[PDB]
Amino acid sequence: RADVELERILAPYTDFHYRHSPDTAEGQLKEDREARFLASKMGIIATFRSWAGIINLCKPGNSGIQSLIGVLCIPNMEIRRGLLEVLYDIFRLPLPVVTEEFIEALLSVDPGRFQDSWRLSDGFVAAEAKTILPHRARSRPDLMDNYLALILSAFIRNGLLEGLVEVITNSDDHISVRATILLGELLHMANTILPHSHSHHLHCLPTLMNMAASFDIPKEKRLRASAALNCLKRFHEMKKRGPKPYSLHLDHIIQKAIATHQKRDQILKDTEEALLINLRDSQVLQHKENLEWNWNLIGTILKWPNVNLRNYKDEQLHRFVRRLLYFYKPSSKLYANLDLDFAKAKQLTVVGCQFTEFLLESEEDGQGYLEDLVKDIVQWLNASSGMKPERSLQNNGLLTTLSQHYFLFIGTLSCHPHGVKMLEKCSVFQCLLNLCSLKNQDHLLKLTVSSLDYSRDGLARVILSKILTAATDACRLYA
């Protein structure tokens, strides 16, 4: 039949009092409604993904889509919360968390949110980089965008945007936030998928804007619309930023990538007065213990443009680097023992990489202090990996501690031309070459793949070639 067979699935949402079974127990009456909504939701989604259902539900005359959108404007709280979950799944959008504040709900929709497949056990970098870095396709047609463009156009024609504006300004606090995010998603989706003619009058929102600049309407309704525009504007900035790296292993890859593509296209006096004042406030001298030093003033001294242990030859600075040298020493168990949840691991890890580059700048002088650091890392590898028949079981310690953030220290040293030469003196590439053929160690092999720099030639790509052809099948798959 015409309008009674297929439209039966819309009954649970369109009818506020729906009774599917004439005879049923009243004990599970409340649970019955929840079961009906869940089962009906999977039916509406299923009929909107088939061409035989899109056309029948969007006929020019009276159709089910107009009844579905029309019932959204009715001030009912049980139906509105049900319908919004349907709309997110039709367009395949991430669902935000239930809250009454927009900021908390906005942080749960960002594409750069952490996922459980990004850990060391799962895909370390390859899984993470898929959803952050964009695909290398600029002309290949995307058949899924064509499907969404037609679906989005149909809802706009029937009046979806006008319905959402009514929901935003005339519903509960925790419902308007879900509707505001959905409205923000559709606008961003419509300015990059839809053609110009459909979307040239779409970003103006005539109905929402008039409820803002109107002093005749009640003030409570006016400010709800005005606050919606401010909240909706902040959603635009989230898409403008785009995805951002979450792990330092991926972060360092991007930093080196842009650096080498910008150097091919051909600040302060730093008097001793500034250094002495800053050094005394670093607290690393008078208090010879961690957890007291002001780490904010430590990084600035390291990556300050002119101070490099060579231009400013000072005895006090020699103590400062020597004091910090003992903290990051692998043998001196003051840093490797820290848990992965120190709540300051990000700052501490960056400073360590920020420190090893400082020594490399003073090639003639800092090589003495830098040679000590690299030697103990090799000794740490010979014990943690277990290549002396003794331990062979240090896997647990590496994963649960900050000892895993040492490939970053050795990885960043391979970028500079004068750093790879320092590795040969310490003979760390040979240690990395020998550990390629380790069947039991897999997490350690993942770290060295994503830490080395392969921009230039040399032994950096020799080790990578070994891993991708002579190693475990699981390890070679990751490579």
Partner: protein, 53 residues
């Protein structure tokens, strides 16, 4: 990083009057030389909510 373009304006005033502020020295260092990628160009309201919770 949008403040990076204002550095030449303020750097001229500081060198003339010899103003050495500790906190301002830290912020400018992170902008001229990179620190991370998820911290630069960060929405202030998101950061405030994160610290509160």
């Amino acid at each position: 990083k949008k403040y990076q373009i204002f550095i030449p304006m303020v750097n001229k005033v500081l060198v003339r009057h010899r103003i050495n502020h500790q906190r301002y020295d830290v912020l400018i260092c992170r902008i001229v030389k990179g620190y991370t990628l998820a911290d630069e160009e960060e929405d202030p309201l998101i950061y405030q909510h994160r610290m509160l919770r």
